[PDB]
Design a protein around this ligand. Structure first.
Ligand SMILES: CCCCCCCCCCCCO[C@@H]1O[C@H](CO)[C@@H](O[C@H]2O[C@H](CO)[C@@H](O)[C@H](O)[C@H]2O)[C@H](O)[C@H]1O
Lengths: 48, 48
C-alpha cells in the first residue's frame, strides 16, 4: 500500500509482478502465488 | 519453445522468465536451467 496516496493500485500490482512475485515463488513450499487488485500493464490506445 | 527472429536476450527475458516462474511451483525440483540461442529456440531443463 501507499499510505500517502503516492502510488495507485495499478503501479503497485505491476511492481509486485516485476519485483515481488518471482522472488517469492523461489521460496520453498510455495505452490501458487496470486495477485488480486487492478490489472496488468497494457498499451491503451483510446481512439476518438 | 520458439521465438522466431527474437534476440536471445529478449527470448530469455520474455519467454524463459515466466516459464521459470510457473515451473517453480513444482515439487522435488533440484535446479532449473534455460538456454536461448540465436536460432530462436529456448530450451529449459528442469532437473529433479
Ligand atoms: C485475498 C483473497 C484470497 C482468497 C483465497 C482464495 C481461496 C478462495 C476459494 C478459491 C477461489 C479463488 O479463486 C481465485 O479467484 C481470483 C479472483 O479473485 C482469480 O484471480 C484472477 O482474477 C483476478 C481479478 O482480475 C486477477 O487479479 C488475477 O490475476 C487472476 O488470476 C484467481 O485466479 C483464483 O484463484
Amino acid at each position: 500500500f501507499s499510505p500517502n496516496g503516492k502510488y495507485d493500485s495499478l503501479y503497485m500490482r505491476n511492481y509486485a509482478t516485476l519485483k515481488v512475485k518471482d522472488e517469492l515463488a523461489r521460496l520453498p513450499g510455495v505452490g501458487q502465488i496470486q495477485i488480486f487488485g487492478s490489472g496488468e500493464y497494457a498499451m491503451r490506445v483510446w481512439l476518438d | 519453445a520458439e521465438y522466431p527472429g527474437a534476440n536471445p536476450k529478449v527470448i530469455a527475458e520474455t519467454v524463459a522468465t515466466p516459464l521459470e516462474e510457473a515451473i517453480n511451483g513444482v515439487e522435488n525440483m533440484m535446479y532449473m536451467k534455460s538456454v536461448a540461442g540465436s536460432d530462436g529456440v529456448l530450451v529449459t531443463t528442469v532437473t529433479f
